[PDB]
Amino acid sequence: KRLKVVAAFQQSGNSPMGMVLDAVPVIPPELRPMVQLDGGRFATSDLNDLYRRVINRNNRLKRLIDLGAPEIIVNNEKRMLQESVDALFDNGRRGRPVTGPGNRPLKSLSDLLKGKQGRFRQNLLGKRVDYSGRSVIVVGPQLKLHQCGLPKLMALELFKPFVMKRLVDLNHAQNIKSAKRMVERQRPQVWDVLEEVIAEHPVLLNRAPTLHRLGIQAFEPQLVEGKAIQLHPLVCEAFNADFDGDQMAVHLPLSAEAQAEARILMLSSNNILSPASGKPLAMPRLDMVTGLY
Amino acid sequence: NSVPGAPNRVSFAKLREPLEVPGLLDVQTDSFEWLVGSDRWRQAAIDRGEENPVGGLEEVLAELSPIEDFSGSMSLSFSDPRFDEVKASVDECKDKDMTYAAPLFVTAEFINNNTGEIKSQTVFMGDFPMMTEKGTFIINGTERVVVSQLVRSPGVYFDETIDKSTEKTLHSVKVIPGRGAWLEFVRIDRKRRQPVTVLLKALGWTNEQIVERFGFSEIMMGTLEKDTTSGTDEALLDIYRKLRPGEPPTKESAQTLLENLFFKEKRYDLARVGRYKVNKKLTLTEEDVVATIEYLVRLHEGQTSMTVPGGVEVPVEVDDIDHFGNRRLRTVGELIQNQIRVGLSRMERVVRERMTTQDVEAITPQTLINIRPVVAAIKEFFGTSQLSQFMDQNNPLSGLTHKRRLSALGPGGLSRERAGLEVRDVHPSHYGRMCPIETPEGPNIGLIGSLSVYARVNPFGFIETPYRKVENGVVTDQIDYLTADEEDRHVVAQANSPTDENGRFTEDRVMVRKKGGEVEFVSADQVDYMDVSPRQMVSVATAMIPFLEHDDANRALMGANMQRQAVPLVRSEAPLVGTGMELRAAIDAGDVVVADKTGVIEEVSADYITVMADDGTRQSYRLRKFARSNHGTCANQRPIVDAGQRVEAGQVIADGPCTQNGEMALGKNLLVAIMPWEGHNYEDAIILSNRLVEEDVLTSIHIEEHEIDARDTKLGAEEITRDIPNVSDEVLADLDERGIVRIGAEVRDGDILVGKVTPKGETELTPEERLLRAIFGEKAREVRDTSLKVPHGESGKVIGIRVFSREDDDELPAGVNELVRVYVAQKRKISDGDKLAGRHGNKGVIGKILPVEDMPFLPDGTPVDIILNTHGVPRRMNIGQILETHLGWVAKAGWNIDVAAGVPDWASKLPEELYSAPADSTVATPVFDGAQEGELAGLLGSTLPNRDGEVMVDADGKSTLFDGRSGEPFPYPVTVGYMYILKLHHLVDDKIHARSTGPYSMITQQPLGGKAQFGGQRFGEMECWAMQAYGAAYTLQELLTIKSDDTVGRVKVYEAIVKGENIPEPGIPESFKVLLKELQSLCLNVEVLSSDGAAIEMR
Amino acid sequence: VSQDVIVREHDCETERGINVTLAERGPDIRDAHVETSAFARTLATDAVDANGNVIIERGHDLGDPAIDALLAAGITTVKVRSVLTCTSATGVCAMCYGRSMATGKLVDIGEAVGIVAAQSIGEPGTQLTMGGLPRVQELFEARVPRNKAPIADVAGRVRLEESDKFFKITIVPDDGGE
Amino acid sequence: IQQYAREPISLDQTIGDEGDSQLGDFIEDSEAVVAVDAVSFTLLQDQLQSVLETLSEREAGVVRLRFGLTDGQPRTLDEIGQVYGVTRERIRQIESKTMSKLRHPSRSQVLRDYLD
Amino acid sequence: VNFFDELRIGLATADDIRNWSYGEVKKPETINYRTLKPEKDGLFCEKIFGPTRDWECYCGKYKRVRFKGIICERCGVEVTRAKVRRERMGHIELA
Amino acid sequence: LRVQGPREVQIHLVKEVQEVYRAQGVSIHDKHIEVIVRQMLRRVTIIDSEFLPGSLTERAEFEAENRRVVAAGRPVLMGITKASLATDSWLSAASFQETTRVLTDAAINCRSDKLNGLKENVIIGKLIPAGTGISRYRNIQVQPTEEARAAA
DNA sequence: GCTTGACAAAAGTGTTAAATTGTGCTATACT
Ligand SMILES: C/C(=C\[C@H](C)CCCCC(=O)O)[C@@H]1O[C@@H]2C=C[C@@H]1OC(=O)\C=C/C=C\C=C\[C@H]1O[C@@H]3C[C@H]1O[C@@H](/C=C/C[C@H]1O[C@H](C[C@H](O)[C@H]1C)[C@@H](O)[C@@H](O)/C=C/CC/C=C/C2)[C@@H]3C
Ligand SMILES: [Zn+2]
Ligand SMILES: [Zn+2]
């Protein structure tokens, strides 16, 4: 075992001296922001108090060194300076963690990367996106397999930049500023415009949790009255969707490639059999069973 | 029943409730009355109980009294706490954002032993929050509730766990005190490697006494021979270095180490609950320590009886931590008490140390006393504490259940994942104490539960249940409340057993409950106590589900949870087929107006109702009108009485939000059809008659509170004004002089409510922006526009405005000159997508709403209002919905049982003078005593008008419906009836979100989620998996680059869409750039390398 | 673990494979599941009827008709291509993998079968009562079994012996050896 | 004084209270680029370029140097007179005239919607 | 660029940390309690990390994009976009 | 494994896994299970060395180097968690689990990530090397036929 | 077409007073 580490340093040009720091890097201020909320009160990242303990103790150390000091005093400082950097990097990894008011432990540099709330799982392998929406779903029994009911309000916002250009292309609005206000206040002229932009422009429908890739499927949007979403009754199996009040998310593919992939790969009617057993999924169920039986 | 104004609701119960439902809010009140110890509580303990009642305040005051330092030269004694009259009224507090509190004063005695003087000074501790009549508190203007906690009572508990290594039995013991280090058998304060014998030498007992007291114990003698410790002071050293490693000991420290850790009262606190538990089971001293070891020895030997010098014989058996005998509830009064103790112990530190550095004889109770930590404890408890919660009021029921809720979470108990699943399992001792049926569906299952109906809390924190003791096969009228411990001692007869004349056991054998519990029989000779009535185990919400016995616990738990999720309607019609609790629970909720003195009505107005008592006294009641509730539901009340009416003490003067004529109405009665209909109601979806819209039967009101403040800015002062830097004179059309929306106006998303402006700093306008300023001559204004506007997707009418100004005195935090609150309300019609449900756990969204013209409709021409699918009914194991669907039709059209000859056989054991009821009469079927299947059928055939004399429903509960579209009858008979369905707080208007572009997070550039921020959806790990499974790279990349994190890319794509150009190529996700930076800050050198191109820079 | 697995090429050309039972002894009877084992596969070597008939050539999709045909000739086993034996340098090959359950045809070259496999295994896990998720995780994690059971170390007859509270099994080799 | 004594708060606190989120991620970025504005601002920049085309070579030349459209650096009446070789007053005059020309409804009608 | 071949890590030497750094932060000071502006030589110091406002030095002697990438001889702040405040790192020299 | 050999272990593991899912009435084609099993046997233990004893090295990576013109091992069975952590991509192992552990060993070994795996490309915003992201597909060039341009 | 002188507001500079900010210090004895 001890040879593994010793060997690692040989092949690499890394000097093992790197494991001791003569200098500590300080993160950019916008990543450790301090800002005032609405009302004027302030809030700031924990890193600043952690950086504050380190720079405090390091400076106090310089002070004691210059005067000259009994080792007991100077050694006590170095031990403190050692702990302060440890907390900055990984807080609580050794001994009790540095805490603020209410006895809650401060957030170290390591606490940014690790966990479901860290950068990877939170801001990296997933994230919130533009051109998306959600609502509760209602049955689509009159819909074609490739279609979905889309609340007109929802659709207007999703496509807002598109309809803004269409109604400026037409004389409806003279400039983009007027086009924006024309959509915001929902002048009745936009609706006939919205139906054009939405035409043959697909959208992705997701319901969490997403178990198999069938949990996301494209559909052709159809403007619907009401604030709910009309879902085709045959896709409930794939989505595991109950109408007990579940909700679903809508995403708008933008680039040509994205729309191509929507229509071709993820289109609702192209995915029928489950890609595990090969058995049919969209196959009728419940009422349709007893209805045919 | 036995309520003066109670409406007439006929019951099928075959029993007679021997005991009225106790006051449901007592648990919250008595606890607080004990804490403050008012005279209403004093009389309680004095009549039957202790002769020295101690209020919670005094109890914690006795602990501090007196204060003395190491020298004992000066002492400070506390006594006689006092409360003044409340500062302001609850209605005033909720208006002004203050807390409802009575100031507290104390007697502070300061005695100097050397000078022998006395300085007596009246001390002001602080404003002490007071509990309302409803059992709530007003904390900073919002109404809150303090939930009672479940904790393991301090005591000695043993457990036997088999070790796989030896595959043999092992016994471990634990003693958990009120405070101080805990010991386990030695294992003390997380220090293992201990010879339980060595500590008996730490006290100084000689080895001779070990062979004397141990006696028959084999390992008792064998371990002392194994231990190499020689001497009493040398064992205290072997115990010293492991407990205090790194500190060289001393004969003075080593000996007081053991005494100060436990025997000393300061660091080891004897618990009244702990002191009582073990004192019978066997503050601390030796007698308790040696008793535990002797108890453990006999438990591993297998003897069931243990006795030692000068002690009472008790059984040696393992204990159950989940048995309610060893598990107690911490009531609000106690949860408050503990937080006061914490405040005094922190002040005691400042009192003691202040004496030393303060000039002697120049110090007074006021100088030594500093109440900063004392009030901080109270203020810090009512806010931010897990047990102090925003009261949940959707409806009177939701609130009444919040109080009475008991939980195992929060400080002082197992928290979240730590708790094992064994605790969640319902114990046999939960009967009549904690309702098994009502709990959360999610990760909290079994950790949260509601107190049962007749359950009652003990002054020691153990729940008691009412029982009727039986002697010699005769059940007396004696009712005795028994704790879980004493219940297992006796045998519990079943609530429903055949009753004999003046009373006696008629049945040959009687149902019984054992200490197992175990269910067995006898001849009725050996029974001691019997149940007070059915539904002892049930809670208030659970007892409100008609036909509870028929529905599976799964769907029932869903049924209770969804009653508390209902919303008050405008009409608020009561249930047609109910249970007993409907009326009793509405009055105990506090949302109904009750009259406290017999008298007559002087006046009745929408504003207030006044009554002239027989006493000549005059009471009056101001009616809550359209008061926005905590969650937005409407609190409006309406008077149910007329001018000349007589009334009686405890009657109902006016209805609350969800109540009608005194009983809870959580929904409406609707005509139901169980046929599947054209695929529109499918997979739990529902369809409605458009009548429910036109007639506002499911309509409900919702109210929002918007708030904006004008503060002092370092660059100036914020000013609320009608002047906005750039706006049309039209956008201000609805604003008044001050700049606030005019009352009664309509507001649309993005509309201005309160115009506000804040100073600006050096502007440096763009050259293109300055040229237009000169051309059109609009002078660039000195102040930016920060103005309150209505949130996205929200609209309504302006109800009222509340303005707090600095000019006007009022009060505001430092820096805040003016604060205005605008209240908007809206009438929400029942809409497709809204969530409805019945009491049985059946839930579903509205899938479609059809014109009354084309609907399944009876031969009358009467369209059914709702159509429920047939498929989800049978599999979910809730058949109550069908029953109440039949009975719902019974009560609607009336009925007459045949008087021809005698009474039919189905009525043999059955209803008393229920043989006839008019049309629309209301029914009540108590949960386990309710109507029975036989009696249903007999009623199914019954009185048959509509107007003309034809029957509209057969004895199977079916009818022939005509399709309203084609106009032809449906081939088969369809079940129709009336079912009670509730509107639920999940609404489409609130749940529908859409985003194109919007705000972005500061550190990370991603869009910030939630509707408040106008944010976007989260495309997560699992979703990216599905995207990858499909093999779409461009769709995936697009979502994670130009749709969220790409600062230059998201602005280009927008530019591209507006110009109809091609969407550009994505950039580098800002989050990743942040990653390299956070890795560099760790002293990790992360270099992005080209193929042959070495290092790359991100800039 | 599987997310980097994707079809990189049409055919790796190896002759290796695995033997599917496909039926036993009847009548004297398709194997209980040939739908999840034999079907959707691709023949590694020609399926030879008794004597020389060769009822199905190597590289056949093995649909429902091919199984009935094969059964007629009385073949009680078949050697098939599998990703276990696939020799592809990177990823796997379409031929070894076999038909795409979603498409009904030979897998496309872009397909990422690792993720599709992971999801296909996990998604039903919600229906696994827990002989359950604990046993499955035990297998994929390769941990020593909960209650370990012995396997024969070599061929030969067995001598069983009972010491109460225990068992003794001795295998007398056919060598006969130790 | 009581405003000075206020102490800041942690962006890393969890106020979700079974919201899982932390305060810090609820903070908007007010200096973030707004796509619709920057696009419209680019469209405004084009519309001005056109309106100036109607003006004389020196009329527009003075307007551009006066507000610093090309350089982003405005210039004083005297400095513009130094390039065109006149007195600052003469430039003051040419200013007033081209502005009443811009105020002419033909050129102004199109830029009205850009007020803000 | 969006296309890079390799991404590599390694122990950061004190020299690397110093090369990254645009200056040493010598004080545990966030911002002034009155003006609420960044304190010099402390955390947030504009002299080291970067300007608060685009093309604006601390004192303001050079407020214009006319000269980018010049440092103000008084406050010592560089004139450039405030985006650099998010890209730049300091360092601390331990005793 | 040590008794019947690597190719037999896979047959076993697939049978066992397929039995649990068969008890609950779940139909999963064996190939899916096989894709996962394949990843457990992909490495072998190095008994003698360029290589160190006890280390788990990729099978293919072990064959070409060991030859070295003119070092023995045994097949290794390892669980999915342990197998995935051995992946050649350090930032893919980091985001998976035991981040601090992974980063400390990657910085000492001075590891270089070629960004071949698809998770790596997701983090940095590249096109995953699968589906439409593969070279042959994304490099497709499209032009109308000369015969079609004539028809205009 | 454009310039000249008178002129006042606006913008910089230099000079001073007021304020804000940093640091030293406090001797019964107290570990
Ligand atoms: C999880 C929890 C409280 C959650 C906030 C709510 C409980 C969720 C369970 C569920 O509703 O299914 C625990 O609460 C206490 C201590 C530890 C835990 O705190 C936790 O783990 C987390 C938070 C604990 C207290 C938070 C207080 C403040 O957070 C907000 C404002 C303050 O009070 C909160 C209001 C809670 C009232 C809830 O009441 C319920 C319905 C809604 O969930 C809420 C209206 C009603 O059904 C009511 O009957 C249920 C009360 C829960 C009884 C639990 C007591 C133990 C609101 C969320
Ligand atoms: Zn292959
Ligand atoms: Zn400067």
Q: Among all chains, which residue has been given the structure tokens 């949790």?
A: A209
Query: Residue B647 corresponds to which tokens in the numbers above?
Result: 């009334």
* Residues whose Cβ atom is located within 5 A of ion ligand 3: E 57, 59, 61, 72, 74-75
Sorted by sequence, the CB contacts under 8 Å of residue A260 that are 6+ apart come out as B1034
Closest Cα of chain A to E37: distance in Å? 11
Question: For a substitution probing ligand 1, which of B136, B386, B445 has the most ligand atoms within 8 Å of its CB?
Answer: B386
Query: Residue B192 corresponds to which tokens in the numbers above?
Result: 């293992």
C-alpha pair distances (Å), E92 with each of B1085, C89, F6? 17, 49, 55
Identify the experimental approach: X-ray
Specify whether the CB–CB gap between B148 and B448 falls below 8 A.
no
Sorted by sequence, the CB contacts under 8 Å of residue B160 that are 6+ apart come out as B169, B170, B171, B172, B299, B318
- Number of C-beta neighbours around residue B460 at 10 A: 13
C-alpha pair distances (Å), B171 with each of B140, B157, B160, B195, B217? 52, 11, 4, 15, 14
Q: Resolution limit in angstroms? A: 3.1
The Cα–Cα gap between F78 and B675 comes to 56
Cβ of residue B774 closer than 8 Å to a chain A Cβ: no
Query: Residue C135 corresponds to which tokens in the numbers above?
Result: 């046993």
Query: Residue F121 corresponds to which tokens in the numbers above?
Result: 């490309």
Q: Name the nucleotide with the smallest C1'–CA separation from D91.
A: G2
Pairwise CB contact (< 8 Å): B1057 & A165 = yes
Residue B577: beta bridge partners? B923
Q: Which ranges of D3-113 does DSSP label H, i.e. alpha helix?
A: 35-54, 57-67, 77-83, 88-102, 105-111
A64-72 contacts: CB < 8 A, separation 24 or more? A65/E95
DSSP letter string, B653-718: EEE-SSEETTEE--EEEEEEE-S--TTTS-TT-EEEETHHHHTTSS-EEEEEEEEEEEEEETTEE-
Q: Among all chains, which residue has been given the structure tokens 């400390």?
A: F104
| Whether residue B863 has a cis bond before it, omega within 30° of 0 | no
Cβ of residue C36 closer than 8 Å to a chain A Cβ: yes
The Cα–Cα gap between B714 and B180 comes to 51
Task: Report the atom number in ligand 1 closest to the C-alpha of B416.
Answer: 21
Residue ranges lining ligand 1, Cβ < 6 Å? B 147, 386-387, 389-390, 392, 401-402, 405, 407, 409-410, 440, 442, 444, 448, 564; D 17-18
Specify whether the CB–CB gap between D62 and D88 falls below 8 A.
no
H, E, C per residue of B806-823? CCCCCCCCCCEEEEEEEE
The Cα–Cα gap between E17 and B591 comes to 66
Element (H, E) at A3: helix A2-11
- Going by C-alpha positions, the residue among A260, F32, A261, A275 that lies closest to residue C105 is A275
Residue environment code for C75-92, b if the CB has 16+ CB neighbours within 10 A, otherwise e: beebbbbbbbbbebeebb
Compute the C-alpha angle B964/B968/B969, nearest 5°. 100
Compute the C-alpha angle B272/B273/B278, nearest 5°. 105
Residue environment code for B790-812, b if the CB has 16+ CB neighbours within 10 A, otherwise e: bebbbebebbebeebebeeeeeb
The Cα–Cα gap between C140 and C2 comes to 12
Query: Residue A166 corresponds to which tokens in the numbers above?
Result: 């269409």
Compute the CA torsion angle C93, C94, C99, C103 (nearest 10 deg): 130
Cα(F35) to centroid of ligand 2, in Å? 12
Q: Name the nucleotide with the smallest C1'–CA separation from D90.
A: G2
What's the CATH number where B518 sits?
2.30.150.10
- Going by C-alpha positions, the residue among E48, E53, E36, E41 that lies closest to residue E77 is E48
Specify whether the CB–CB gap between B377 and B342 falls below 8 A.
yes
Compute the C-alpha angle B1029/B1030/B1031, nearest 5°. 90
Chain B residues 793-812 with CB within 8 Å of chain F: none
* Strand G: positions under 7 A of a protein C-beta atom: 2-5, 20-21, 30
* Residues whose Cβ atom is located within 5 A of ion ligand 2: C 12, 86, 93, 96
Q: Among all chains, which residue has been given the structure tokens 């690792």?
A: C114
D93 touches strand G (CB under 7 A): yes
Residue B388: beta bridge partners? B146
Residue B670: beta bridge partners? B979
The Cα–Cα gap between D107 and D92 comes to 21
Backbone angles phi, psi at B510, to 5 degrees: -125, 140
Q: Is C86 annotated as a binding residue?
A: yes
Size of interface B-F (CB pairs under 8 A): 51
D19 touches strand G (CB under 7 A): no
Specify whether the CB–CB gap between A135 and B833 falls below 8 A.
yes
Sorted by sequence, the CB contacts under 8 Å of residue A181 that are 6+ apart come out as none
Cβ of residue C33 closer than 8 Å to a chain A Cβ: no
C-alpha pair distances (Å), B531 with each of B2, B475, B546? 22, 10, 21
The Cα–Cα gap between B811 and B472 comes to 70
Q: Name the nucleotide with the smallest C1'–CA separation from D89.
A: G3
Local structure of C91: helix, strand or coil:
coil
Element (H, E) at F106: helix F99-108
Task: Report the atom number in ligand 1 closest to the C-alpha of B631.
Answer: 45
Region of C25 on the Ramachandran plot (φ > 0 left; ψ -120 to 50 alpha; else beta):
left
The Cα–Cα gap between B2 and A51 comes to 71
Local structure of B611: helix, strand or coil:
strand
Parent domain of B484: 448-530
* Residue C39 with chain F: CB contacts under 8 Å: 29
Pairwise CB contact (< 8 Å): D31 & E82 = yes
Cα(B659) to centroid of ligand 1, in Å? 25
Q: Among all chains, which residue has been given the structure tokens 């708030």?
A: B707
Sorted by sequence, the CB contacts under 8 Å of residue B203 that are 6+ apart come out as B232, B258, B286
Compute the C-alpha angle B548/B550/B551, nearest 5°. 70
Specify whether the CB–CB gap between B918 and B4 falls below 8 A.
no
Cβ of residue B1029 closer than 8 Å to a chain D Cβ: no
- Number of C-beta neighbours around residue B634 at 10 A: 21
Cβ of residue D11 closer than 8 Å to a chain E Cβ: no
The Cα–Cα gap between B519 and B536 comes to 17
D8 touches strand G (CB under 7 A): no
The Cα–Cα gap between B240 and B236 comes to 6
The Cα–Cα gap between D50 and D68 comes to 17
Cα(B389) to centroid of ligand 1, in Å? 7
Query: Residue D6 corresponds to which tokens in the numbers above?
Result: 């206020």
Element (H, E) at A154: helix A152-158
Residue with the smallest CA separation from ligand 1 atom 43 is B392
The Cα–Cα gap between C95 and C93 comes to 5
Region of D58 on the Ramachandran plot (φ > 0 left; ψ -120 to 50 alpha; else beta):
alpha
The packing angle between helices D35-54 and B767-776, to 10°, is 60
